[PDB]
Design a protein around this ligand. Sequence first.
Ligand SMILES: Nc1ncnc2c1ncn2[C@@H]1O[C@H](COP(=O)(O)OP(=O)(O)O)[C@@H](O)[C@H]1O
Ligand SMILES: Nc1ncnc2c1ncn2[C@@H]1O[C@H](COP(=O)(O)OP(=O)(O)O)[C@@H](O)[C@H]1O
Ligand SMILES: [Mg+2]
Ligand SMILES: [Mg+2]
Lengths: 160, 74, 375, 375
Amino acid sequence: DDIYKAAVEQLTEEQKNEFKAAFDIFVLGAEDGCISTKELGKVMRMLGQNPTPEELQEMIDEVDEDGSGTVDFDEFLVMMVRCMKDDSKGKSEEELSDLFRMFDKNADGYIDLDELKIMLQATGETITEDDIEELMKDGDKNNDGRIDYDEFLEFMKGVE
Amino acid sequence: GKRQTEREKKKKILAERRKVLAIDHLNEDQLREKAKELWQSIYNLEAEKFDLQEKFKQQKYEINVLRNRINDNQ
Amino acid sequence: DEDETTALVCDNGSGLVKAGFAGDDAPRAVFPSIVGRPRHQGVMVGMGQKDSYVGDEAQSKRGILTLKYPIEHGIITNWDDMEKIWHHTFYNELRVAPEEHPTLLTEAPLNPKANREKMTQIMFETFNVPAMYVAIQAVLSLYASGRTTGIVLDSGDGVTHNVPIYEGYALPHAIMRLDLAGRDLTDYLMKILTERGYSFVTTAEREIVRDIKEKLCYVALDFENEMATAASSSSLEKSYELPDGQVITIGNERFRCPETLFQPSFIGMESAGIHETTYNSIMKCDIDIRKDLYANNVMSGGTTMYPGIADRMQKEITALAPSTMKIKIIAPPERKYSVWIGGSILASLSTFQQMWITKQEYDEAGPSIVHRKCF
Amino acid sequence: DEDETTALVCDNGSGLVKAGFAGDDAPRAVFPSIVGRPRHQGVMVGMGQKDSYVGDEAQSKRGILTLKYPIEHGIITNWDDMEKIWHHTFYNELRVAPEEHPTLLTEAPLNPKANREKMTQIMFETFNVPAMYVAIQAVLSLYASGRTTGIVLDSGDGVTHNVPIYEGYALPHAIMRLDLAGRDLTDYLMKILTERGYSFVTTAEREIVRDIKEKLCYVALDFENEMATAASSSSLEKSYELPDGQVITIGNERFRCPETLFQPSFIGMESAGIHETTYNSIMKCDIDIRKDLYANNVMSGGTTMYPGIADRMQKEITALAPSTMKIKIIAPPERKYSVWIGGSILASLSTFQQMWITKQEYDEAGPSIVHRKCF
Ligand SMILES: Nc1ncnc2c1ncn2[C@@H]1O[C@H](COP(=O)(O)OP(=O)(O)O)[C@@H](O)[C@H]1O
Ligand SMILES: Nc1ncnc2c1ncn2[C@@H]1O[C@H](COP(=O)(O)OP(=O)(O)O)[C@@H](O)[C@H]1O
Ligand SMILES: [Mg+2]
Ligand SMILES: [Mg+2]
């Protein structure tokens, strides 16, 4: 699926290398190599965060969808990418404001829907309905008809 | 009030920035090397004048950004 | 900002400020001339704590601010207030820098010459406008009507001016200013509503009652007969829904409030009604053209949105003047913007930049140059 | 103790003391404001024989101690009692030394200025807190709601305060204190239970009956009709299991006890119900914003855990005020901690240390400096 490679792309190499070499703190010998779900909470204490029963149980629910009682390495990477939200070691904002200038091609102060449609089709994918619809739900909150720099920053947080 | 301050602050700034040449005594070769240097200086000044103009336009753009952030605020 | 260096057009009308760009049909930033100031001192933190509040911000924050008028009947209180409101208009509302656009301004009729000299000097020092021109709102309303003959009744919020102009020429000898305006209207209505049981002093209720004047007020065709029939007048009596939700009912007061301008003896003015002021103005000048003045009278101002001024005007002038020639008033809809439109008209033609008041002329001759550059 | 020098956040609410560290979500040490003293003298040895008993220790030792209130409706009895309870809170309960952490405290609305000056002076001399700040609980509850507009109903255990604040500005001219609170509730319930056959005077039964109020009490939708249908009401009548094991049954009293705040004439107050006190408070201020006050009312206090205040509140205000705009109350669960949360919020931002009340300012200007440093 595309979530596995998106998690690959949204996380830096040093972080994931340390994550895996440090997950290898539970394995000791003559083991399957994949530790029980609950032990995952313990590696998190090593990470420096102090999560809570609500998030812990939810996050537990975020692994092992098919119901094997065990976690693989790709689910491991997607959950880790889904845990700390400080992606890209802090997404920038200045060049991003330049990119805000980029979304707009009529120099008005905001992003028109037509400008979004041309921007999206310039990638190579055409327009489908769920695309723009979901992109609007992600970007906007009150039907203001445009994407300003706050909604701009919010929508793509962590994305490189 | 401030009538002379602004004018002579500007003239003072342009005096420290620019360099004055005792052109009358300048020798043949000296006119050569210096008019080359002056033309190159004007070249660089126009270069980052154009840079200033562009970046003026973008700072206008971020004014646009912030003023729209304000008008939405009501 | 437009790519072209077109001029700024700003009408600082006595009661409303309407600003925009030249070549535009309507002003972009239009706000009332009220200014709000923090009623108390600062102890809280995290938001607000700003001194000057202008425009719709102050309109929303009317209750928390002492509402003050930087100008009343032309008199200037504090130039800093104009400085701040012009800053707000140019940058927060017009999103324009005055460095690259000359300004055409309109001033109240017969404004002080000392006022002009001080305002121009503070303007030129504080701001960096390239060029200047200021004109009387009378000729601006004339331009909006586009007819060189007529007498202009400018009904601002501080003064009402009657100015005759024949074939595009000003007649200062027959120009008069009357101290009756919106302020008086609100005051008189305040005292009548006090006699109706509702007694308020603060400015929020001032705006509420001027809104009532905008919506429900009549101009009585016959005064005492209409109060006589307004004794009961269940149908004729009219009600308003105040924003708090209470229903406030008013009857004869609807046409007893504007009547005071016509009948100043209600609250004690030696001057008679404004129709008398137009009448005297007319006869002061040569007899012959007076008929044309009768037939070419124009009325201008935000108040003109009310009904009843036209019929009353014509009937009383016909009563005073002989009824041979037919008198008819002209008043285009939304004429409170008309002055600003005329400003755009001034910037339309290519001769207007022959007499821009540039920076160097002011630097040479000081403010005094305007004494020779405008008139 | 945290390695960082973060501030102390302590809500000395009139009825509960909730203390902890800044940056925390909930106070760590929360105890009622009762204080127990030895009912008799010392002859035994080997254990106990300690004067002051505070917190859960006194709760367990309620029977053996005379239970006294160091504060009632804001009035201060003995500063030594506060000294001891603060010692207990800081060292035995919070395990913190006040030397290295500035303290943010919350005080009951409209507390005496002399009370503030004496408490601050004894505090600074007795303790070694580096810096100080004290604030009214009204703005703290506002911060917990996170909305600058609204009227706060603070229902403590000694006083109920109604305070309007519009756009984060206090309105002392429309703030009132009512002497009805938990004490009154317990008293009235005591007399009704006396008329039910059970007559107790001591404080243990006071806590039992306030627990009954916490568990079983109703707020009657219609009063006399509900006693009329509560005549028999086998299903509607509700019982409680007292810790001794006896089953005590109460019917209409469940909704006849909180009703007294709404109907003070039951035990003789000139002031009408607290809804009238919110109503008058609202009209005292300008008319226009009153609608917003109607729509932005907030209620705070430990009592708010009871059901029925919201429906009664809205219905009666809609009965008193016009029903055009919709009135809705907001009350987050577990709002008795909310004030303390707001204290943490105050320590969250980096501007808060600009106005810490340091030791040297107090040493220079005495206690009087607070008169200029807080307000
Ligand atoms: N839409 C409207 N309908 C009726 N009256 C209005 C309206 N807008 C403004 N006014 C009145 O016009 C007055 C302001 O007059 P103004 O137009 O500023 O005079 P001037 O033409 O000298 O600038 C205000 O006091 C207000 O009562
Ligand atoms: N969990 C609870 N449920 C119901 N009522 C409570 C609860 N906890 C405390 N109370 C009531 O709250 C009162 C104390 O109010 P308090 O919260 O101290 O007021 P303030 O908000 O002014 O500090 C006590 O008299 C008690 O009856
Ligand atoms: Mg006018
Ligand atoms: Mg309380």
